């Protein structure tokens, strides 16, 4: 009787997630905003006050953004005319109000079009980048010093990354580092002045006459990339009309030798600086490790401190060279590798010694470290029951490697299986975020003793509205493909019944390091194809796939569009086997990387998927950017993986589409993965006399996420499965 | 019989019509390409020979696209590397071959990337533009003397039309006119230093890694236009020293004012030059009457033989003003006008004499001048049994204008009802080509006694076949709206029978002055839905519509978008009464014009469609072409006609096509109506919520035709009427 979940349901958020996202301002306080009031709350004790009345800046006269609070708590950055560019990349407006006066500064104010901003570590000292040059304000009130003037629009940039770097290498804008004294202020310039462009039209409002075109410097596969430097400024020593001296590091020789990246920039102490560089072929990289010298004022990088990374299997890293955790006293440091079994764990290393020290081991992976004191080192792994797709904390007594605590795993078993967590400064305190298989769980624990101290959110309000509906469930499980274990979920209708058979939709990604099976809880359009529709809807992770060693994700190393297409396709095909599911209505569909397997897929004549779907697919490697490409698949070159790059695309299976139905959508002002890339597969399909469906997107980018774009994809999409179903 | 007229019939040309292409090259001898060979005919007796044997330029390496034989017959001009550029314009590789001697010339050669090469009218001087400059070559075998310098790409173009010019004023890539001496060349030159440039992506081969961005000027509604200069050249007086002395010929001070165009250039005499200009407003229109002055070596334009054109009720002429015929002295001309009752009639001027004479007169129009001597004009009408959509050509006599005959009126009247024709030279021979109700029939003809000749094609072949084919009928009839008469054709499936209930495609056209209700017989995709689905496939020459007199052609000035759309929902609704037709199952499409009024019509909330499909439509009036749109709807600015232009846009009615299934259709290299025109529909159908399907065709233009293009887009089409008429 209760009622289904509905694509409106999903369409306009009517079952919300709670949240509980917190900012650490120090060992045992955080931020949090409630009714819009920026409160800031007592860990031990849990009592708040607050710190910015909801009322205040009612009067300002515009929608504030966003904020930011001085460490050194005098003042707070208000952003207001946010306009966004890329993924984390964006423009606004900035004021200044003076806590210890009711004030707004009224001089020398951060211009607007400001492209970043950012306070000193302590105190109230602010950077930002305005016209692509950085400046320095070391007063909230008082003129700017100017840094750079090499700033030029599209062509090089200081302190800020340029498209690639952004997106591919940072997943930032900003590439301005301060020191933690606040004292130097180190940075990168970027130089695309060779980078060729990609150019496609935006249309905007009805208004406009002619469209405009967006060009934007882009490195696809192959193409000459964007060179880098790295300087470092001391911001004590700045004079109001003398121009600043900016020094600079070289990267190392074995760098220069060719093209390369910096991959990651960290200040182990206040005259320490830790840069990870990276070959363009990312086969090999180097941690530099260089020091201020109070005589010289310059800065030294022993190459007999150089520490290196190198894989034979495959490339570096998942996406990237890991993070180096540096001690207290920068003299060593913590950081996930690979070991000789190619499962990621934690390697100690000291810095004037060479090897490291495993102090993790075993058939899972450490994803992430997040907190270093001198008694402990807290983690995130996947080892709890041996799942993959589980994710909980866990601790190490440093006086012992294995004296080892999960501190996560039994406290509520059956509901929380995926945890992250964020750790007061000093790691005095935590707090915990389960993300499934049950309602999302906020927690606050206390660190000596690993004390529960509250809840923060659980979702109770959620928790009454789901049980007046008919909610799917969810299956987490695997099956052996050739003497191995692989990971599936499946999506099932409410009152699920064996004894029947179900059509099956195979939702696909399955890029590089990807997982789709897991344990997170989710309401999305997968929850309303089989609360609604009665659809199973499975996700496999199959070779290629992470976070179960190298064997596993290396196997498509230099080899994309292969074994993770076949192995689809497989698990699709023992599915078929499941009593359950009906061999005539399987259907497969993706986004990015799932567009482009599902494209394979449907063009493999395999005889599996009636129809599918791909959205934004990727349709042949030499269209994407330099840094994900090369990166899995080297350069397109004869002279290396040409052939591989010219074997793996869409295009080359266009005759096999004609057994299938196909939707193919795309959002014309993609910078990312360009609708180039869709364009070139339906000229294909065309050249052949194949029929298929389609459907562009006006002005809109790889999210397709507007709110209207993302209701009529959707509603679309919804049309085309129920049909491929014929289901009414 | 049998077998029915197919989908793959129409795509494959399974039924070719047969045609006689001929080329007069004298009062009396035309040139015929049957095979590859060219033949030379004699019309008075009819005996033949070959001219060029197909096997001449075996050894040439490479493939001929064209010819074109010098007027003295002296040599012939072989086109190869022909490489598309828009409608008309085209570049291309040129050689002269010698035909006395058997020699190709080797010395001083027409350049490749010729952009357009002319022989004199008689004899065999050579005139061509090459980088936007004009050459002239007195002899194939010398040096080309330059006559301009000023040529730049996208610039300034001598010799040759701009985008606007090419398509919209003079349809045609040329803008050279030599005189009938081959004494003097005259010629246009194009600027468009400030007229804006359409932006939009060509994707290429597979092969390219990143798109070419294509840009054209190309004036939109109330944008800047091209200015344009005429001038002319005394080829008699060239010398390789010296530089060519080109004589402007100004455009006349009421021209001067304000925006104008060069609309058309005519030669009277040896010494006498024509020009009609219009006003942007294209309400006004100026002819010119320009004499060379044998002393000055100038042009004179007398302000006093200037004759006027000025319409009341709408714009001049059809799509531009017509074209004067000038009697052989060239004291005088005759040249088609809307007569006191809006009626298209031939009027007779003498050059320095006030008024006109008109010689025709009637309910009916005439559609064309096609001849004139001594003692006859010959011409082209639709007075026949007062059918709009018929054609004839008939003969009047000079000394008397009520002597009339109907030459073709009688020749197979069931037949034979839409006629054109193509005149010898001195018009002492016809070649008229009849187009339908029948099969096509081509016949030669001698003028001094209307005598039939020959019969030159008469499709014996094709009707042989079509004889074991069900093929559909046509029905060419009208409706009385108010007390005005509006017709219609359908094309019906074979054994119709009015007892049962088909549906109904209305396809339609409907831009200013067009007409699709006629007599014309036609193998196309209205063919196969009614041969073998059984669809009635109707069009409707409502209010805009041409031949008919001004009342209803000028019935939309300023208005396009109001009448001739509200006609085709009502034709729909009358189509309904007759019951035949099941008004369940009513759909409409077009392209084009079409697309537009498609558009507009499922988005009047009319509820008489179910669905339509709309191809490369024009969406709002100021994404097109200046020439085009202002003559029909003035300027967009809110002193002339914004207003209207803002209140007839697709855009505008969204939220009405929830009630009706829409397919949108359009290429992404449109460089005529923009593939911006559809982004904008479809983002205003998402902005809304409104599901549709759509389809765009990647490097394709207005025309999608290349082959495979053609063949996937009414195959896609197809299956959307059927499914839309719940036809298997
Ligand atoms: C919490 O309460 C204590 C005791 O009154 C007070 O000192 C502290 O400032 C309070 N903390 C907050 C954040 O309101
Ligand atoms: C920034 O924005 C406002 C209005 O857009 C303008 O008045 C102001 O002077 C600009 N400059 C600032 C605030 O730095
Ligand atoms: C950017 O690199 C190019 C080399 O192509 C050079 O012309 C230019 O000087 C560089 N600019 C800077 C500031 O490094
Ligand atoms: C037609 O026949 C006449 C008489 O023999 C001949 O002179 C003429 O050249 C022929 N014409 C053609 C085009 O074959
Ligand atoms: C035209 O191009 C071809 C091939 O590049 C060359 O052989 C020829 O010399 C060129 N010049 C001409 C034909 O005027
Ligand atoms: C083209 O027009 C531009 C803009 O007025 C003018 O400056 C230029 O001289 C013109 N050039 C020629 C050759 O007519
Ligand atoms: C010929 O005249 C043009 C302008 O009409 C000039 O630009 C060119 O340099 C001249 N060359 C000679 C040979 O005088
Ligand atoms: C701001 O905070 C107060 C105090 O809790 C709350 O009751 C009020 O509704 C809030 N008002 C706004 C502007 O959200
Ligand atoms: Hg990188
Ligand atoms: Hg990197
Ligand atoms: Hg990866
Ligand atoms: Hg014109
Ligand atoms: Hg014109
Ligand atoms: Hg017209």
Redesign the pocket.
């Given at each position: 009787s209760r009622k289904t979940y509905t694509l409106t349901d999903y369409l306009k958020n009517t079952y919300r997630l709670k949240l509980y996202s917190l900012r650490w301002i120090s060992d045992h306080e955080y931020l949090y905003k409630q009714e819009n009031n920026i409160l800031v709350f007592n860990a031990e004790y849990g009592n708040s006050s607050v710190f910015l009345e909801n009322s205040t800046f009612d009067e300002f006269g515009h929608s504030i953004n966003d904020y930011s609070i001085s460490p050194d708590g005098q003042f707070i950055l208000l952003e207001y005319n946010y306009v966004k560019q890329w993924r984390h990349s964006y423009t606004a407006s900035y004021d200044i109000y003076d806590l210890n006066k009711r004030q707004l500064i009224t001089e020398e104010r951060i211009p607007n079009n400001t492209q970043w901003v950012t306070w000193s570590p302590v105190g109230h000292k602010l950077a930002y980048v305005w016209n692509n040059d950085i400046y320095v304000k070391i007063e909230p009130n008082l003129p700017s010093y100017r840094i750079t003037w090499?700033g030029k629009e599209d062509?090089?940039y200081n302190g800020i990354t340029d498209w690639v770097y952004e997106e591919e290498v940072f997943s930032a804008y900003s590439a301005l580092w301060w020191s933690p004294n606040g004292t130097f202020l180190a940075y990168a310039?970027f130089?695309d002045?060779?980078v060729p462009l990609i150019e496609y039209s935006f249309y905007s409002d009805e208004s406009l006459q002619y469209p405009k075109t967006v060009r934007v410097p882009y490195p696809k596969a192959g193409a000459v990339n964007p060179?880098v430097?790295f300087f470092v400024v001391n911001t004590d020593s700045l004079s109001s009309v003398t121009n600043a001296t900016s020094i600079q590091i070289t990267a190392p020789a074995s760098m220069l030798i060719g093209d390369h990246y910096l991959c990651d920039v960290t200040w182990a102490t206040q005259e320490r600086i830790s840069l990870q560089w990276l070959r363009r072929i990312q086969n090999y990289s180097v941690m530099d490790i260089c020091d201020y010298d109070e005589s010289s004022g310059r800065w030294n990088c022993l190459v007999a401190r150089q520490h290196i990374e190198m894989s034979t299997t495959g490339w570096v890293g998942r996406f990237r060279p890991s993070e180096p955790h540096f001690t207290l006293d920068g003299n060593s440091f913590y950081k996930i590798i690979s070991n000789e079994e190619g499962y990621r764990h934690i390697c100690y290393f000291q810095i004037d010694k060479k090897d490291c020290t495993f102090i993790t081991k075993g058939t899972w992976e450490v994803i992430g470290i997040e907190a270093l004191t001198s008694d402990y080192l807290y983690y995130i792994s996947n080892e709890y029951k041996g799942m993959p797709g589980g994710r909980n904390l866990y601790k190490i007594q440093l006086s012992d490697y294995t004296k080892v605590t999960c501190l996560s795993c039994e406290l509520n078993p059956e509901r929380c299986q995926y945890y992250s967590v964020s750790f007061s400064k000093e790691a005095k305190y935590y707090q915990l975020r389960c993300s499934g298989p049950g309602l999302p769980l906020y927690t606050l624990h206390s660190s000596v003793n690993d004390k529960g101290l509250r809840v923060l959110e659980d979702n109770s309000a959620l928790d009454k509205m789901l049980q007046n509906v008919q909610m799917p469930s969810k299956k987490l499980d695997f099956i052996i493909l050739n003497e191995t274990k692989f990971w599936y979920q499946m999506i099932l209708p409410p009152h699920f019944d064996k004894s029947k058979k179900y059509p099956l939709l195979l939702d696909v990604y399955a890029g590089p390091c990807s997982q789709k099976a897991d344990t997170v809880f989710r309401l999305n359009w997968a929850t309303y194809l089989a609360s609604t529709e009665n659809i199973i809807v499975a996700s496999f992770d199959g070779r290629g796939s992470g976070y179960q060693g190298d064997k596993i994700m290396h196997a498509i190393n230099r080899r994309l569009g292969t074994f993770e297409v076949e192995d689809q396709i497989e698990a699709a095909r023992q599915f078929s086997k499941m009593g359950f599911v009906d061999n005539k209505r399987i259907a497969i569909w993706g986004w990015s990387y799932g567009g482009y397997v599902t494209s394979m897929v449907l063009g493999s004549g395999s005889g599996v998927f009636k129809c599918g779907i791909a959205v934004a697919p990727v349709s042949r490697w030499e269209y994407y950017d330099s840094v994900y490409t090369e990166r899995y698949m080297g350069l397109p070159t004869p002279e290396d993986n040409l052939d591989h790059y010219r074997n793996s695309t869409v295009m080359s299976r266009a005759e096999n589409f004609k057994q299938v139905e196909y939707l193919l959508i795309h959002g014309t002002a993609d910078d990312n993965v360009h609708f180039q890339q869709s364009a070139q597969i339906s000229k294909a399909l065309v050249d052949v006399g194949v029929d298929f469906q389609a459907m562009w997107y006006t002005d809109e980018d790889h999210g397709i996420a507007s709110s209207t774009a993302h209701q009529h994809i959707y509603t679309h999409m919804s049309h085309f499965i129920k049909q491929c179903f014929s289901l009414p």
């Amino acid at each position: 009787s209760r009622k289904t979940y509905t694509l409106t349901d999903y369409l306009k958020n009517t079952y919300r997630l709670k949240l509980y996202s917190l900012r650490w301002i120090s060992d045992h306080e955080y931020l949090y905003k409630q009714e819009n009031n920026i409160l800031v709350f007592n860990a031990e004790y849990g009592n708040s006050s607050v710190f910015l009345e909801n009322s205040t800046f009612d009067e300002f006269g515009h929608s504030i953004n966003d904020y930011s609070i001085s460490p050194d708590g005098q003042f707070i950055l208000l952003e207001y005319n946010y306009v966004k560019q890329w993924r984390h990349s964006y423009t606004a407006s900035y004021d200044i109000y003076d806590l210890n006066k009711r004030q707004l500064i009224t001089e020398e104010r951060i211009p607007n079009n400001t492209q970043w901003v950012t306070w000193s570590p302590v105190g109230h000292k602010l950077a930002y980048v305005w016209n692509n040059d950085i400046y320095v304000k070391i007063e909230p009130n008082l003129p700017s010093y100017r840094i750079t003037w090499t700033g030029k629009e599209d062509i090089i940039y200081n302190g800020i990354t340029d498209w690639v770097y952004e997106e591919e290498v940072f997943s930032a804008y900003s590439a301005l580092w301060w020191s933690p004294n606040g004292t130097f202020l180190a940075y990168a310039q970027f130089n695309d002045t060779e980078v060729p462009l990609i150019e496609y039209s935006f249309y905007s409002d009805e208004s406009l006459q002619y469209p405009k075109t967006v060009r934007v410097p882009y490195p696809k596969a192959g193409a000459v990339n964007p060179t880098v430097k790295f300087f470092v400024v001391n911001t004590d020593s700045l004079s109001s009309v003398t121009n600043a001296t900016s020094i600079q590091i070289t990267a190392p020789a074995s760098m220069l030798i060719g093209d390369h990246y910096l991959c990651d920039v960290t200040w182990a102490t206040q005259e320490r600086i830790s840069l990870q560089w990276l070959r363009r072929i990312q086969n090999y990289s180097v941690m530099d490790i260089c020091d201020y010298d109070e005589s010289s004022g310059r800065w030294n990088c022993l190459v007999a401190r150089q520490h290196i990374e190198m894989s034979t299997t495959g490339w570096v890293g998942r996406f990237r060279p890991s993070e180096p955790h540096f001690t207290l006293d920068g003299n060593s440091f913590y950081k996930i590798i690979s070991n000789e079994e190619g499962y990621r764990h934690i390697c100690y290393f000291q810095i004037d010694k060479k090897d490291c020290t495993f102090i993790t081991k075993g058939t899972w992976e450490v994803i992430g470290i997040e907190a270093l004191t001198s008694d402990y080192l807290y983690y995130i792994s996947n080892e709890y029951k041996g799942m993959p797709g589980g994710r909980n904390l866990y601790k190490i007594q440093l006086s012992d490697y294995t004296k080892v605590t999960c501190l996560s795993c039994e406290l509520n078993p059956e509901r929380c299986q995926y945890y992250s967590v964020s750790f007061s400064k000093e790691a005095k305190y935590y707090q915990l975020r389960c993300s499934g298989p049950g309602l999302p769980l906020y927690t606050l624990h206390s660190s000596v003793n690993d004390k529960g101290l509250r809840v923060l959110e659980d979702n109770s309000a959620l928790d009454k509205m789901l049980q007046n509906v008919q909610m799917p469930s969810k299956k987490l499980d695997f099956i052996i493909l050739n003497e191995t274990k692989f990971w599936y979920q499946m999506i099932l209708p409410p009152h699920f019944d064996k004894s029947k058979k179900y059509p099956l939709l195979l939702d696909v990604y399955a890029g590089p390091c990807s997982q789709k099976a897991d344990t997170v809880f989710r309401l999305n359009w997968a929850t309303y194809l089989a609360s609604t529709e009665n659809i199973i809807v499975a996700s496999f992770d199959g070779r290629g796939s992470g976070y179960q060693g190298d064997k596993i994700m290396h196997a498509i190393n230099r080899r994309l569009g292969t074994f993770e297409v076949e192995d689809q396709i497989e698990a699709a095909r023992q599915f078929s086997k499941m009593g359950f599911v009906d061999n005539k209505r399987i259907a497969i569909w993706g986004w990015s990387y799932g567009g482009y397997v599902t494209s394979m897929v449907l063009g493999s004549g395999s005889g599996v998927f009636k129809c599918g779907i791909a959205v934004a697919p990727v349709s042949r490697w030499e269209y994407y950017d330099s840094v994900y490409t090369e990166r899995y698949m080297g350069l397109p070159t004869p002279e290396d993986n040409l052939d591989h790059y010219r074997n793996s695309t869409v295009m080359s299976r266009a005759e096999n589409f004609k057994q299938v139905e196909y939707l193919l959508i795309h959002g014309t002002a993609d910078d990312n993965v360009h609708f180039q890339q869709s364009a070139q597969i339906s000229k294909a399909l065309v050249d052949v006399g194949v029929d298929f469906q389609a459907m562009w997107y006006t002005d809109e980018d790889h999210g397709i996420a507007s709110s209207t774009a993302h209701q009529h994809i959707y509603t679309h999409m919804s049309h085309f499965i129920k049909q491929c179903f014929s289901l009414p």
